[PDB]
Amino acid sequence: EFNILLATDSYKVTHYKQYPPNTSKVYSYFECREKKYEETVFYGLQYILNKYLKGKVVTKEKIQEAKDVYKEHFQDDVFNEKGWNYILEKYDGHLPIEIKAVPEGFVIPRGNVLFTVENTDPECYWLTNWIETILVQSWYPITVATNSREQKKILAKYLLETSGNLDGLEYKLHDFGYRGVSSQETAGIGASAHLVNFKGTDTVAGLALIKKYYGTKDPVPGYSVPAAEHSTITAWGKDHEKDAFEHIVTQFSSVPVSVVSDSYDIYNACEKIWGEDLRHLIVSRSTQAPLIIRPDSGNPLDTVLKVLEILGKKFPVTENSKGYKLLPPYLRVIQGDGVDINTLQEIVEGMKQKMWSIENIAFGSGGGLLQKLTRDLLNCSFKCSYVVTNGLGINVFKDPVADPNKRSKKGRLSLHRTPAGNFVTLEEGKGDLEEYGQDLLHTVFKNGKVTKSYSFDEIRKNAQLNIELE
Amino acid sequence: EFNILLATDSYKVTHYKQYPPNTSKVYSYFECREKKYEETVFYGLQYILNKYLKGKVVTKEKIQEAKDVYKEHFQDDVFNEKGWNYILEKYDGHLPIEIKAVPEGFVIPRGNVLFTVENTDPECYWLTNWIETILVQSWYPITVATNSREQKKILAKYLLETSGNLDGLEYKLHDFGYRGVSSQETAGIGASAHLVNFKGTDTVAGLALIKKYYGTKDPVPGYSVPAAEHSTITAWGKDHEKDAFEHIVTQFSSVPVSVVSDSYDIYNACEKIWGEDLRHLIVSRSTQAPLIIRPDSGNPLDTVLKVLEILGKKFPVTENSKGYKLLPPYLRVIQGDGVDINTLQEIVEGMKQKMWSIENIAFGSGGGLLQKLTRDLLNCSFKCSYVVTNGLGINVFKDPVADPNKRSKKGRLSLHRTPAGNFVTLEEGKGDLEEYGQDLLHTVFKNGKVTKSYSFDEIRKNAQLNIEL
Ligand SMILES: O=C(Nc1ccc(S(=O)(=O)c2ccccc2)cc1)[C@H]1C[C@@H]1c1cccnc1
Ligand SMILES: O=C(Nc1ccc(S(=O)(=O)c2ccccc2)cc1)[C@H]1C[C@@H]1c1cccnc1
C-alpha cells in the first residue's frame, strides 16, 4: 500500500511552516537544465500520474500512518495533519494540483520547460513542492529513452553507410538489463523507455508496464528470441561444448537462436566447433532462423573483429552494394558485453574501417542501457519560479554566485515554436503577450484526474529519428 | 499482481530445452567476484525472499498469463507450461528451491560464496536459474551498503584523527537520494541499505521497508531534521533572503535546523546575513538545536573551506585537544552537493590540512549514495557450479580464454573460517571433508518458506566497523 504522505523527502514535511505568510500559490517547473545530449525525449510522466498521483490518494488511515511515522522520524510533532485533512474532507482525497506537460515522446532541446505544477486551492500552497520528489523521478525514463535514442542515431548512421538502408534498425540494440538494475520497478520503467526506440528486449517487466499505462495496437511492444546462457553450455561439461551447441541449435532449428560461445575459448568455438564440426548444421538454416553467435568477454572491438575474421574464412562471405563484407543470411553475431554509448561507437567505427557491414551485428546492453545513468547526465531538475503572496505575484528563482549553470527560470513559463520552427521557453509570463503563438504544454493532470494521455504508439512516433522520417 | 513467471530474462523461458537430458539437479551460487572494495556487506536477500519468492507464487491464472505473453513475445510457443503446472499441482504453487546464505550484515572479502541455490525436486532442474534474474538484483542493496560502509571508514578515520573520538559518526552521512534514484522501489531498498551504516535519512521509503521485512527494537531505524529547500527561501523574493532566514530559524528555534544558504551568494549569506544581521539569533541557540548552514554549489572542497574560513571570523572558534579548529556548538555545516566516496575523501583531507575538525561538518549524498552504482563495481554474479546428470554429479564452470577475471567456481561450495579467522570458500564439495569447521551458509529458504530471518538490529551489529568494535 503506497502512501503519498510518506513518498517525499523528509524535510518537505517541514516546509509548510517556512513559506512567506499568506502564500496562496506555489508554481514550479521541470527542465533538463542546459550545461553531448543536446535534446531529450520526454517520457514517463504518464506512468507516475496514473500509478501514484491520480484518484483518492489520501485516506484517514494514511494520514494517521504518516503522523505516527513522522513523530518518531523527527522526534517531534511537525507533520501537517490539518493540511492533509483538508484535502481529504474537501476533495475526497484528490490532489488539488494542475500539471501541464509537453507530449510524451516529444524530442526537446535542453533548457526548455517540460512540465509545470501548481496548486489549484490557496490552502494547498505547500502541496506543489511536496510532490517534487516523486515527479523528479521522471528523470529516469527520460534519461534511458534519450540515451537509447542517441545510440539509435549512431547505429542508423553506420547501418546506412555500410548497407545503404535502415532495414532492421529497430532490432539492433537489445535490452539485457533486467538483472543489472536496482529493482523490479526500475526494470519495468527502464525497459519501457528503451522500447520507445527499439523493439528488442529480454526485460519482460517492460511489457506489462506499457500494456497497463500506455497501450499499443500490437499485442506486445517488444520481442525476444531463444538463446543460451553459460549454464546451458557448461552444464554439459567442459569436454562436451560441441554436444551442447548441437543440442541447442537442433532444438531451435526453425527459429533464430543465440548461442554464447566464449565459455572456454571463443576463437576455438568459432573456428573449429561452429566453423568445422557443426558447420553442416549452420549452412542448412533459413534466413528467418539464423544462428547468432554471442561472444561475451575480452576487448569488445578486438573480439568482434577477430570473430568476424574467423567466420569470414569458414563461411561464404559476400560483398554488398556499398562494398562491405556480409556474412551469409543464416549467420549473425551479437556483442552483449561491455556495450555502452561510447563502446558502441568504437565498435561500429572499427567494423567500418575493416570493411564489415553493420548488417552482420547486433548489440545487447544491460548495465550500460538501464543502470549506468544518473540525474546529472541531463540535469533534470524541479524548481519554483512563481509565487503569490498577499495577492501579489512574484517571479522567483535561484542564481548561485559560484555556479551560473544552476540558475533557474523566472515567473510563469510557456513553451512555444519560434519563427524558424524551433522550441523556445518564455519566462515572466511573456507567453501571455501572444507574440509567439500558443503554449505547447497541455494540461495532463487536474484535481486528481488525468486529463490527457498518449498511447505507446503515439510516443514512438513522436520519438522517431529525423532520418527515419526522411 | 506480480507474476514470477514474468519476472525473468526472456531467454530463460527457453532454457528448459537446453540443459543436458537426464539432468536432475542444477546448483548455482552468488559471489562478488574478485578482480578498493575488498570486502562487501551482505544485505538485501531477505527482502527479495519475502516479497517475491515465498508462499504460493504460481496460480492457474499466472500460468495462462505467462503463456499468452510469451506466445506474442517470442512469436512462438516455447513456454514450459508443463513444468509450471507441476509446481502448481504438486507443491500448491510453492517453489521447490533451497537457498543457503551467509547471515545478513556479514562483511565478507571479495571472491567468496554469499549464497547458493538448488532445486529440491528433480523435475524442477530448470527452476534454479529461472530465478537468477530476481536474485541477482541483490547486487544493489549489497553495493549501496558496502559503498556507504566504505564512506563510514573514511569519516571514522578523519573524525578520530581530528577530534580523538567517534561521537556522532552514525549521523555524519545523510541520505539525500530519494529524487535521484530510478524508482520508488529502488528508493526504499537503497535507503534501507544506507541505514545499515548510518541513522540519518530523508528517504522516507527506507523506514517502511525495514519495518515490514526486517524490524527494529526502536520505533524507527532512521531520523531527519527540519530543513529549508531553495523554494522556501526564494519564495520570499531576492531582496528578502534575510527575512526568509529569520522566519525559518525562529519557526525552528528549539530543534536543529538546516538552512540552504547559496540561493544567490553563499559567501555574502555567511559573512553578512548569518555573520552580522542575524548573528544574535544564532549565538542564542542550544547545543541540542544548532543552525546547520548548507552550501549547495561550487567546488565542494573550496566552498567548504571558504565557508568555514568566513564563519571562523564571525563566530568564536575554539581549538580542541587535538589542535583542530572547532565552531561553537550552536553552529555546524552540511555539504550535500556533489558528494561521493571520492569527493568525500578529498573534502575531509582538505579540512584536515587546514586544521578544521571533522566535528564541524556533516555530509549529505544523493545520487552518489543511491544511484551512481552498478553491478560491475563489486562484480556481483550468479553462476552454475554443479549439476547432476544421469545420477552423476559434475563440477561445472566457465573460464573464458580472454578474461581470467570471469572464471567461475567449481562444484558444491561452502564458506568457512580459516585458522587465522579469515574467510575461505571451499570448492568441489571439499567442505564435506570437515577440515574447516562449520559451513557459515544457513538455509534461509526452502520449498516456499523463509526458514531463517534476521532483524535490522542484528544486521547493523554484523556490519559494524572494526574501529567501532
Ligand atoms: O543474445 C541474446 N539474445 C538476442 C540475440 C540476438 C538478437 S538480434 O540479433 O537482435 C535478432 C532479433 C530478432 C531476430 C533475430 C535476431 C536479439 C536477442 C541473449 C543471450 C543474451 C542475453 C539475454 C538476457 C540477458 N543477458 C544476455
Ligand atoms: O540539510 C538537510 N538535512 C540535514 C542537515 C544536517 C544534518 S546533521 O548535521 O547530520 C544532524 C543530524 C542530527 C541532528 C542534527 C544535525 C542532517 C540532515 C536537508 C536540506 C537537505 C536535503 C534533504 C533532502 C534532499 N536534499 C537535500
CA–CA separation, B200 and B202 (whole Å)? 7
From residue B56, how far is each of B94, B100, B130, B448, B449 by CA, in Å? 5, 20, 17, 7, 10
DSSP A277-291: ITHHHHTTS-TTS-E
Q: How far is CA B256 from the centre of its chain?
A: 27
Residue B79 contacts residue B101 (beta carbons within 8 Å): no
User: Looking at ligand 2, which atom is closest to the CA of residue B296?
Assistant: 27
Query: CA-CA distance, B32 to B44, in Å (whole number)?
Result: 14
Q: Are residues A11 and B224, on separate chains, in Cβ contact within 8 Å? A: yes
Q: Name the residue among A195, A118, A113 with its Cα closest to residue A370.
A: A195
**Among the listed residues A108, A145, A98, the one whose alpha carbon sits nearest the alpha carbon of residue A33:** A108
Q: Which one of the ligands is nearest to B358 CA?
A: 2
* DSSP state at residue A200: B
Provide the grid cell at A16: 509548510
Residues 6+ apart with CB under 8 A from B464: none
Q: How far apart are CA B462 and CA B103, in angstroms?
A: 8
* Residue of B179, B189, B286, B382 best to disrupt the A interface, most CBs of A under 10 A: B179
User: Which amino acid, one-letter code, is at B446?
Assistant: K
CA distance readout (Å), B381 to A144, A178, A338, B41, B132? 24, 13, 15, 15, 9
Of B79, B83, B81, B75, the residue nearest B23 (C-alpha) = B83
In chain B the first and final C-alpha atoms are separated, in Å, by 44
Cα A58 to Cα A49: distance, rounded to the nearest angstrom: 15
Please indicate the experimental technique that yielded this structure.
Answer: X-ray
Chain position carrying cell 558528494: B339
How many beta carbons lie within 10 A of that of residue B269, not counting itself?
27
Residue A107: enclosing H or E segment and its boundaries?
strand A107-109
Ligand 2 contacts (CB < 6 A) are A 9, 11; B 171, 174, 176, 200, 202, 225, 227, 256, 258, 292, 294, 332, 334, 336, 362, 364
Indicate yes or no: CB of B400 within 8 angstroms of CB of A371. Answer: no
Contact call for residues B53 and B411 (beta carbons, < 8 A)? no
Residue B224 forms contact with A (CB below 8 Å)? yes
Report yes or no: B11 at the A interface, CB cutoff 8 Å.
Answer: yes
Beta-carbon-side half-sphere exposure of residue A225 (alpha carbons within 13 Å) = 24
On whether the CB atoms of residues B447 and B58 are closer than 8 A, the answer is: no
Residue type, A70: Y
B252 touches chain A (CB under 8 A): yes
Q: How far is the CA of A5 from the centre of ligand 2 (A)?
A: 20
Contact residues, chain B, for A365 at CB < 8 Å: none
A469 class by beta-carbon count within 10 Å (0-12 exposed, 13-18 middle, 19+ buried):
exposed
Q: Is B275 annotated as a binding residue?
A: no
Three-state secondary structure readout of chain B: CCCHHHCCEHHHHHHHHCCCCCEEEEEEEEEECCCCCCEEECCCHHHHHHHHHCCCCCCHHHHHHHHHHHHHHHCCCCCCHHHHHHHHHHHCCCCCEEEEECCCCCEEECCCEEEEEEECCHHHCCHHHHCHHHHHCCHHHHHHHHHHHHHHHHHHHHHHHHHCCCCCHHHCEEECCCCCCCCHHHHHHHHHHHCCCCCEECECHHHHHHHHHCCCCCCCCCECCCECCHHHHHCCCHHHHHHHHHHHHHHCCCCCEEEECCCCCHHHHHHHHHHHHCHHHHCCCCCCCCEEEECCCCCHHHHHHHHHHHHHHHCCCEECCCCCEECCCCEEEEECCCCCHHHHHHHHHHHHHCCECHHHEEEEECHHHHCCCCCCCCCEEEEEEEEEECCEEEECCCCCCCCHHHCCCCCCCEEEECCCCCEEEECCCHHHHCCCCCCCCEEEEECCEECCCCCHHHHHHHCCCCCCC
Are B222 and B207 in contact by the 8 Å Cβ rule? The answer is yes
Asked if B203 lies within 8 A of A229 by C-beta distance, the reply is no
Q: Amino acid identity, residue B217? A: K
Cα-to-centroid distance, B293 and ligand 2 (Å): 10
CB-count burial class (<10 Å; 0-12, 13-18, 19+) for B275: middle
The C-alpha atoms of residue B343 and residue B323 are separated, in whole angstroms, by 24
Atom nearest to B224 CA in ligand 2: 18
Residues of chain A with CATH 3.20.20.70: 137-374+454-470
Ligand 1 proximity of B75 Cβ (cutoff 6 Å):
no
Question: What is the CA angle A391-A393-A399, rounded to 5?
Answer: 140
Q: Say how far apart CA A441 and CA A30 lie, in whole Å.
A: 12
Would an 8 Å CB–CB cutoff place B90 in contact with chain A? no
- Which residues of A are known binding-site members? 179, 202, 230, 294-296, 336-337, 367, 375
The answer, yes or no, to whether any atom of ligand 1 lies below 6 A from the CB of A197, is: no
Q: Which residues pair with A380 in a beta bridge?
A: A32
What topology is assigned to B137-374+454-469 in CATH? Answer: TIM Barrel (3.20.20)
Cα of A410 from ligand 2 centre, angstroms: 27
B296 is annotated as contributing to ligand binding: yes
User: What is the rounded distance in angstroms from the CA atom of residue A186 to the CA atom of residue A40?
Assistant: 19
Contact A7 B205 (CB under 8 A): yes
Q: What sign results for the dihedral spanned by CA atoms A394, A398, A401, A407?
A: negative
* CB–CB contact B375 A180 (8 Å): yes
**Which of B167, B169, B171 best tests ligand 2's pocket when mutated (most atoms within 8 Å of CB)?**
B171
Domain with CATH 3.20.20.70 in chain B: 137-374+454-469
* Residue from A31, A193, A177, A217 nearest A105 by CA: A193
Nearest CA of chain B to the CA of A1: how many Å? 10
Using an 8 Å CB-CB cutoff, list chain A residues near B310: none
Provide the 3-class DSSP secondary structure of residue A169: helix
Give the Å distance between the CA of A95 and the centre of ligand 2: 28
Q: Are B3 and B64 in contact (CB under 8 A)?
A: no
Per-residue three-class SS string for A136-168? HCCHHHHHHHHHHHHHHHHHHHHHHHHHCCCCC
Instruction: Measure B140 CA to ligand 1 centroid, in angstroms.
Output: 25
Atom 23 in ligand 2: residue holding the nearest Cα:
B176
CA dist B28 and B136 (Å) reads 12
Decide whether any atom of ligand 1 lies within 6 Å of the A364 Cβ: yes
What is the Cα–Cα distance from B120 to B343, expressed in whole angstroms?
Answer: 48
Question: Do the beta carbons of residue B399 and residue B407 sit within 8 Å?
Answer: yes
Chain B residues touching residue A404 (CB < 8 angstroms): none
Three-state SS at A126: coil
Residue A61 is inside which H or E element, if any?
helix A60-74
Residues 48 through 87 of chain B touching chain A, CB cutoff 8 Å: 52, 69, 72-76, 78
> Which atom of ligand 1 lies nearest, measured to the CA of A179?
25
**DSSP single-letter state for residue A55:** S
- How far is Cα B246 from Cα B251, in angstroms, rounded to an integer? 9
Q: Say how many C-beta atoms besides its own lie within 10 A of residue A122's C-beta.
A: 12
The highest-level CATH class for domain A137-374+454-470 is: alpha beta
Rounded-to-10 torsion of CA B260, B264, B267, B273: -70
Chain B residue at shortest CA distance from A75: B223
Q: How far apart are CA B226 and CA B191, in angstroms?
A: 19
Q: In what order do the strands lie in the sheet with A173-175?
A: A173-175, A361-365, A331-335, A291-294, A257-260
Backbone angles phi, psi at B258, to 5 degrees: -100, 130
Q: Are B365 and B335 in contact (CB under 8 A)?
A: no
Q: Taking chain A, what is the end-to-end CA distance rounded to the nearest angstrom? A: 47
CA distance A226 to A305: 25
Q: Does residue A362 line the site of ligand 1, with CB under 6 A?
A: yes
B215 CB contacts (<8 Å, ≥6 apart)?
A: B455, B456, B457
Which cell is B72 given? 506474442
Take residue B286 and report the three cell numbers written for it. Answer: 542550544
